Design a protein around this ligand. Structure first.
Ligand SMILES: [Mg+2]
Ligand SMILES: [Mg+2]
Ligand SMILES: [Mg+2]
Ligand SMILES: [Mg+2]
Ligand SMILES: [Mg+2]
Ligand SMILES: [Mg+2]
Ligand SMILES: [Mg+2]
Ligand SMILES: [Mg+2]
Ligand SMILES: [Mg+2]
Ligand SMILES: [Mg+2]
Ligand SMILES: [Mg+2]
Ligand SMILES: [Mg+2]
Ligand SMILES: [Mg+2]
Ligand SMILES: [Mg+2]
Ligand SMILES: [Mg+2]
Ligand SMILES: [Mg+2]
Ligand SMILES: [Mg+2]
Ligand SMILES: [Mg+2]
Ligand SMILES: [Mg+2]
Ligand SMILES: [Mg+2]
Ligand SMILES: [Mg+2]
Ligand SMILES: [Mg+2]
Ligand SMILES: [Mg+2]
Ligand SMILES: [Mg+2]
Ligand SMILES: [Mg+2]
Ligand SMILES: [Mg+2]
Ligand SMILES: [Mg+2]
Ligand SMILES: [Mg+2]
Ligand SMILES: [Mg+2]
Ligand SMILES: [Mg+2]
Ligand SMILES: [Mg+2]
Ligand SMILES: [Mg+2]
Ligand SMILES: [Mg+2]
Ligand SMILES: [Mg+2]
Ligand SMILES: [Mg+2]
Ligand SMILES: [Mg+2]
Ligand SMILES: [Mg+2]
Ligand SMILES: [Mg+2]
Ligand SMILES: [Mg+2]
Ligand SMILES: [Mg+2]
Ligand SMILES: [Mg+2]
Ligand SMILES: [Mg+2]
Ligand SMILES: [Mg+2]
Ligand SMILES: [Mg+2]
Ligand SMILES: [Mg+2]
Ligand SMILES: [Mg+2]
Ligand SMILES: [Mg+2]
Ligand SMILES: [Mg+2]
Ligand SMILES: [Mg+2]
Ligand SMILES: [Mg+2]
Ligand SMILES: [Mg+2]
Ligand SMILES: [Mg+2]
Ligand SMILES: [Mg+2]
Ligand SMILES: [Mg+2]
Ligand SMILES: [Mg+2]
Ligand SMILES: [Mg+2]
Ligand SMILES: [Mg+2]
Ligand SMILES: [Mg+2]
Ligand SMILES: [Mg+2]
Ligand SMILES: [Mg+2]
Ligand SMILES: [Mg+2]
Ligand SMILES: [Mg+2]
Ligand SMILES: [Mg+2]
Ligand SMILES: [Mg+2]
Ligand SMILES: [Mg+2]
Ligand SMILES: [Mg+2]
Ligand SMILES: [Mg+2]
Ligand SMILES: [Mg+2]
Ligand SMILES: [Mg+2]
Ligand SMILES: [Mg+2]
Ligand SMILES: [Mg+2]
Ligand SMILES: [Mg+2]
Ligand SMILES: [Mg+2]
Ligand SMILES: [Mg+2]
Ligand SMILES: [Mg+2]
Ligand SMILES: [Mg+2]
Ligand SMILES: [Mg+2]
Ligand SMILES: [Mg+2]
Ligand SMILES: [Mg+2]
Ligand SMILES: [Mg+2]
Ligand SMILES: [Mg+2]
Ligand SMILES: [Mg+2]
Ligand SMILES: [Mg+2]
Ligand SMILES: [Mg+2]
Ligand SMILES: [Mg+2]
Ligand SMILES: [Mg+2]
Ligand SMILES: [Mg+2]
Ligand SMILES: [Mg+2]
Ligand SMILES: [Mg+2]
Ligand SMILES: [Mg+2]
Ligand SMILES: [Mg+2]
Ligand SMILES: [Mg+2]
Ligand SMILES: [Mg+2]
Lengths: 68, 100, 88, 275, 114
RNA sequence: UGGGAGAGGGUGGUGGAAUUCCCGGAGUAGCGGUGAAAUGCGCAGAUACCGGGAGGAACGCCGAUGGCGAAGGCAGCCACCUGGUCCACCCGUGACGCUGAGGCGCGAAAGCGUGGGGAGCAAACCGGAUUAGAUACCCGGGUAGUCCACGCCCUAAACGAUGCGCGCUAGGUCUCUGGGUCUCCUGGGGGCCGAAGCUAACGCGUUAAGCGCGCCGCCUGGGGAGUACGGCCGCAAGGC
């Protein structure tokens, strides 16, 4: 179940697209590894950097408590 | 010049009048620094992922200005003086990068 | 940085004929432009040693052009350095 | 940037002088000076009450505006920055659009030709004065009043400053130059920025004569005296202190705290200086 | 006396500490490997954590508490056994969250952690 | 001329996690630590929990066998200033090239000077253990320093223990980054296995340690010794 398939077109540089970027995050709020996102090398760097801007604007979490 | 995107987060507990004055300070500041607003998007209240200034919400603004590159840092500094401005991110505008 | 317009103006001012974009005069002038703007950068950023290597490389590149232009036509050489105020 | 001398005399080897680089005017405003009455450290009884003082260079007193809330809303042009012999800071000549001229102490980075203004509406810019309650937390300030309308008392020496740390009711909390944390009333005025001439501290006088120019007469050690004179006086040959080191008047001088215990301002001081 | 509250499990390699708090986080009672009588390396065991969680739950239930939220910090041995001991105690475990502090690369750690 | 990727460099800002300390609350008999302990801390209220505050340093996930740099080395994010480098077009100049004794600049850490800063860590130091002993390894403390600015120092397992440039000599496979007609192909990087050949062997092998040319640096048995003397450099330590 890889993330990038479950989505149509999206801008890898849009730091405000919470609903899309939120999907590239572990349930604890961490950035998901490539094996879980299906992104290439070049795409994953863009995803990482725009996730980080989004967190700084308060739109994405830096970390989440792990609920069982 | 260059096109930038000015992101601003404000105190979510201001009345519409105080908010109007805060947008007035911002708009004149943009003007005073030679920022040419092209687009502008105002999303207002949004539940944040973490409390900013010990509050779970934030009032969001967004401007797709165009301005001379040597002044954007000073504009960022001036926009940040107001106690009611909680975040300012002046990012460079760039072409979208699309997957799928 | 240097703008596209700013560069073209230097090229036309030193082109040996219409559309010459690679003669010794154009190369030296182009390098003299970058050297001068980088020297001004280094005065403010005296700790930018990595960019300073850039400058020595440009300076050495411009130097070898001049040694060549000085060997092949002294009058063109003497005119070029004064048209740029070089004389090291 | 402090300036050095070549060692062409034994004293020039280490002597250093201020560069005086910010100074743009070498004469004071005639209407703003008055004679500074020298005391030699003597009081109205003619008794020395502060030892080892006198003989310094003649000085005129430059009248300094330590209120500024005097002239709310009235901007002024920074006409000049000048030397002041009576303080470590430099001073800045202000030309008010009023036509009135005044001196403030020169902040760091103040610029001749810039304008400054005082009041609750003033921009948060170097040289402007505002009540503490309108300056944002984190701002470093100088020339701070301690009580409303009593005049600037805090952070006036070269290079010093205070920082606003928080707000609590009518009061703001400052970190004073000493590191002390203190409540100061919000209606107290301050000037944004630190005091200039921050290289003052690095000056090496270089020779005994230079202290004398400043009116500092030689200081003689208690251990150099006789028992009539000083607790440390006397002994055959050199002597260690032979008792807790003491002042000429007998009180101890290594650690003994001397702030009055029941002082009313203690309710307003949060943390004593740490260094 | 309050029926709803929280149960904190601080579990390190040396010890397990259980703190039962009110809904707002104010401690009501607590226990640990040392409180149930162990000293030294012994109080870092899973059984030690078990007795600690029961002795804390019993004291908590003795002020009328019936449902707790469980917050777990640390990766010590007696961690899971403390969670069991809370469930199988009479207290209703209404949630489980691991709130272990992890630095985003913060202070240099001691020598033993390098 | 037109594009590209990147922890390349410099400056100014700025975000969150965590540690410590301080304050308010709530609570009580221990906490901490180890192979096991003790010193330490704690009823003068600690540990554990919640709220508030202060301050310094480092940036989790992304992150890789990855990328960049000449080397040292470079990792939150934003902006400005700036270097190197690749590709495509095949447009300009017409051998303008290679190397490089001296010189000049850069140069991890530790160290030094002046002045800041100081949370965590931690030489020296103090104490507890361990042990036959234990000036150690382990534990509890702890000052320089670690951090910033400016100026010095100029070392290293500064390593690929492999100087730079060019031409030539099977392929297979993985990967980064461009350009295609996008299967595939073709450039530039980063690895692995291997043709011929090389090598004392180990191994190298289009990223050569193969086959050749140019130029530089260096070796000539171990110890004495990177010592002594001289010289030059450094504030010193000490370097050449
Ligand atoms: Mg965008
Ligand atoms: Mg603000
Ligand atoms: Mg170049
Ligand atoms: Mg020449
Ligand atoms: Mg000199
Ligand atoms: Mg001198
Ligand atoms: Mg001199
Ligand atoms: Mg002499
Ligand atoms: Mg002398
Ligand atoms: Mg002078
Ligand atoms: Mg001066
Ligand atoms: Mg000066
Ligand atoms: Mg005069
Ligand atoms: Mg007069
Ligand atoms: Mg008169
Ligand atoms: Mg007087
Ligand atoms: Mg007097
Ligand atoms: Mg009298
Ligand atoms: Mg009398
Ligand atoms: Mg008398
Ligand atoms: Mg006296
Ligand atoms: Mg006297
Ligand atoms: Mg005098
Ligand atoms: Mg003065
Ligand atoms: Mg009051
Ligand atoms: Mg001075
Ligand atoms: Mg002095
Ligand atoms: Mg003295
Ligand atoms: Mg004396
Ligand atoms: Mg005597
Ligand atoms: Mg007498
Ligand atoms: Mg007597
Ligand atoms: Mg006596
Ligand atoms: Mg005596
Ligand atoms: Mg004696
Ligand atoms: Mg004597
Ligand atoms: Mg004697
Ligand atoms: Mg004597
Ligand atoms: Mg004596
Ligand atoms: Mg004597
Ligand atoms: Mg003696
Ligand atoms: Mg003594
Ligand atoms: Mg004696
Ligand atoms: Mg004695
Ligand atoms: Mg007294
Ligand atoms: Mg008072
Ligand atoms: Mg234990
Ligand atoms: Mg938390
Ligand atoms: Mg180009
Ligand atoms: Mg407390
Ligand atoms: Mg707390
Ligand atoms: Mg990693
Ligand atoms: Mg690598
Ligand atoms: Mg051609
Ligand atoms: Mg031709
Ligand atoms: Mg060379
Ligand atoms: Mg050399
Ligand atoms: Mg170095
Ligand atoms: Mg260092
Ligand atoms: Mg040092
Ligand atoms: Mg030393
Ligand atoms: Mg130092
Ligand atoms: Mg010294
Ligand atoms: Mg010891
Ligand atoms: Mg012994
Ligand atoms: Mg012993
Ligand atoms: Mg020991
Ligand atoms: Mg230790
Ligand atoms: Mg320690
Ligand atoms: Mg220390
Ligand atoms: Mg020391
Ligand atoms: Mg020291
Ligand atoms: Mg340095
Ligand atoms: Mg290596
Ligand atoms: Mg190499
Ligand atoms: Mg070697
Ligand atoms: Mg060779
Ligand atoms: Mg492609
Ligand atoms: Mg490389
Ligand atoms: Mg290749
Ligand atoms: Mg191989
Ligand atoms: Mg073979
Ligand atoms: Mg051979
Ligand atoms: Mg081939
Ligand atoms: Mg190959
Ligand atoms: Mg290679
Ligand atoms: Mg070989
Ligand atoms: Mg060589
Ligand atoms: Mg020998
Ligand atoms: Mg040596
Ligand atoms: Mg030697
Ligand atoms: Mg020698
Ligand atoms: Mg050597």
């Amino acid at each position: 179940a890889k993330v990038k398939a479950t989505l149509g077109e999206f801008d890898l540089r849009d730091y405000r697209n919470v609903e899309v970027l939120k999907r590239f995050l572990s349930e604890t709020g961490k950035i998901l590894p490539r094996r879980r996102t299906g992104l290439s090398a070049k795409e994953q760097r863009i995803l990482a950097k725009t996730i980080k801007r989004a967190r700084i604007l308060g739109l994405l979490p830096f970390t989440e408590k792990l609920v069982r | 010049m260059r096109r930038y995107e000015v992101n601003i987060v404000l105190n979510p507990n201001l009345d519409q009048s105080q908010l109007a004055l805060e947008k007035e300070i911002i708009q004149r500041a943009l003007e005073n620094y030679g920022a040419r607003v092209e687009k502008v998007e105002e999303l207002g209240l949004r539940r944040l992922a973490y409390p900013i200034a010990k509050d779970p919400q934030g009032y969001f603004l967004w401007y797709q200005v165009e301005m001379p590159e040597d002044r954007v840092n000073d504009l960022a500094r001036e926009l940040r003086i107001r106690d009611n401005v909680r975040r300012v991110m002046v990012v460079k505008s760039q072409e979208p990068f699309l997957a799928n | 940085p240097i703008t596209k317009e700013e560069k073209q103006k230097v090229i036309q001012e030193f082109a040996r004929f219409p559309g010459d974009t690679g003669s010794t005069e154009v190369q030296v002038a182009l390098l003299t432009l970058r050297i001068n703007r980088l020297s001004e950068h280094l005065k403010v950023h005296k700790k930018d040693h990595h960019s300073h290597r850039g400058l020595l490389m440009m300076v050495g590149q411009r130097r070898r052009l001049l040694r060549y232009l000085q060997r092949e036509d002294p009058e063109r050489y003497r005119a070029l350095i004064e048209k740029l105020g070089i004389r090291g | 940037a402090v300036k050095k001398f070549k060692p062409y005399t034994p004293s020039r080897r280490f002597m250093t002088v201020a560069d005086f680089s910010e100074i743009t005017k070498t004469e004071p405003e005639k209407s703003l000076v008055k004679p500074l009455k020298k005391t030699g450290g003597r009081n109205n009884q003619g008794r020395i009450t502060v030892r080892f003082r006198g003989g310094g260079h003649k000085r005129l007193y430059r009248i300094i505006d330590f209120k500024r809330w005097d002239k709310v809303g009235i901007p002024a042009k920074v006409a000049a920055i000048e030397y002041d012999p009576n303080r470590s800071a430099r001073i800045a000549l202000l030309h008010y659009v009023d036509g009135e001229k005044r001196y403030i102490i020169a902040p760091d980075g103040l610029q001749v030709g810039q304008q400054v203004v005082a009041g609750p509406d003033a921009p948060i810019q170097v040289g402007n004065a505002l009540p503490l309650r309108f300056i944002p937390v984190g701002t470093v300030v100088h020339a701070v009043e301690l009580e409303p309308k009593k005049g600037a008392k805090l952070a006036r020496a070269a290079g010093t400053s205070a920082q606003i740390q928080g707000r609590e009711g009518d009061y703001v909390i400052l970190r004073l130059p000493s590191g002390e944390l203190r409540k100061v009333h919000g209606e107290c005025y301050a000037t944004v920025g630190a005091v200039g001439n921050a290289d003052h501290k690095n000056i090496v006088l270089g020779k005994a004569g230079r202290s004398r120019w400043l009116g500092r007469r030689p200081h003689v050690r208690g251990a150099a005296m006789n028992p009539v004179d000083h607790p440390h006086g006397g002994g055959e040959g050199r002597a260690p202190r032979g008792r807790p080191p003491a002042s000429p008047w007998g009180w101890q001088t290594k650690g003994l705290k001397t702030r009055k215990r029941r002082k009313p301002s203690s309710r307003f001081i949060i943390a004593r200086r740490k260094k | 006396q309050v029926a709803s509250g929280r149960a904190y499990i601080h579990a390190s390699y040396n010890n397990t500490i259980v703190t039962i708090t009110d809904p707002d986080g104010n401690p009501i009672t607590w226990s640990s490997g040392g409180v149930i009588g162990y000293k030294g390396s012994r109080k870092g065991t899973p059984y030690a954590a078990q007795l600690a969680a029961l002795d804390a739950a019993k004291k908590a239930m003795a002020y009328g508490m019936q449902s707790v939220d469980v917050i777990v910090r640390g990766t010590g041995a007696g961690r899971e056994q403390a969670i069991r001991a809370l469930q199988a105690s009479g207290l209703q475990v209404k949630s489980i969250v691991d709130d272990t502090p992890v630095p985003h690369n913060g202070c240099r750690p001691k020598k033993k952690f390098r």
